[PDB]
Amino acid sequence: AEFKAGSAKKGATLFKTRCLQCHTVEKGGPHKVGPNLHGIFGRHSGQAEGYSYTDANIKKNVLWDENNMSEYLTNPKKYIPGTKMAFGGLKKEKDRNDLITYLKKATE
Ligand code: HEC
Numbered sequence: 001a002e003f004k005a006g007s008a009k010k011g012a013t014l015f016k017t018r019c020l021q022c023h024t025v026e027k028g029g030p031h032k033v034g035p036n037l038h039g040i041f042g043r044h045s046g047q048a049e050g051y052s053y054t055d056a057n058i059k060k061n062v063l064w065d066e067n068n069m070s071e072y073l074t075n076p077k078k079y080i081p082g083t084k085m086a087f088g089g090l091k092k093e094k095d096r097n098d099l100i101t102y103l104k105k106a107t108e
Contacts, residue, residue, distance in 0.1 A: 001074075003066035004097050011102025014095055022087070025106040034085070037107045040064050045080075056082025066104065070096045 015025070022034035029036040035048030042065070046058035060080045062068055072079040073096050075089040090096050 001067060001071050003070050003100055006094065006097035006101045008098070008102040008105060011098040011100070012106070014090070014099045015102060015106070018090060018099070022085070025103070037103070040107050041066070041069075041104055054082060054084050056080050056084075066100050069100055069103075073099065 019034075022032050024030055024032065024036045025038060026036070027038045029038055031048065031051045035051035035053070037048070040048075042063070045060050045062045045064065046053040057080055062072075070093075073090045076083050076085060076087060090099060
C-alpha cells in the first residue's frame with residue numbers, strides 16, 4: 001500500500017525463495033508457470049509477450065507501480081479475484097519493500 005525503498009540484496013534472496021519458481025526477470029527470459037516479469041513496472045497487467053493470462057488478470061488492467069504491486073503481493077487472490085496460482089502472498093511489509101526495491105531494478 002505504501003512502498004519505501006529497502007534492501008535489494010535481501011529482495012534478490014526473497015525473489016529466489018518466493019518468486020523464481022514461477023517467474024523470471026530478464027529481458028527475453030522464459031515464462032515458467034507465471035509470466036516473465038521484464039518491463040512489468042509502468043505497464044498494464046496481462047501484457048507479458050507470449051504468456052496467456054486468466055480473464056481476471058487481463059480485466060484488472062492495473063498500471064503496475066510500486067504501491068499497487070505491494071498491495072497485490074500481500075494477497076494476489078484478494079487484489080485480483082479469479083487469478084489462478086499456488087501463491088498466497090508476501091505478508092511482511094519489510095519483505096515487500098525489499099522485494100520491490102530489487103524487482104524495480106531487475107526488470108528494467
Ligand atoms: C507460482 C506458484 C507463483 C509464485 C510463487 C508467484 N507467482 Fe506471480 N504469478 C503466477 C501466475 C500463474 C501468474 C499469472 C496469473 C494469471 O491470473 O494469469 C502470476 C502473475 C504475476 C504478476 C502479474 C503479471 C502481469 O500482470 O503481467 C506479477 C506482478 C507477479 N506474478 C509477481 C510475483 C512476484 C513478485 C512473486 C514472488 C513474491 C510471485 N509473483 C509469486 C504464479 C506465481
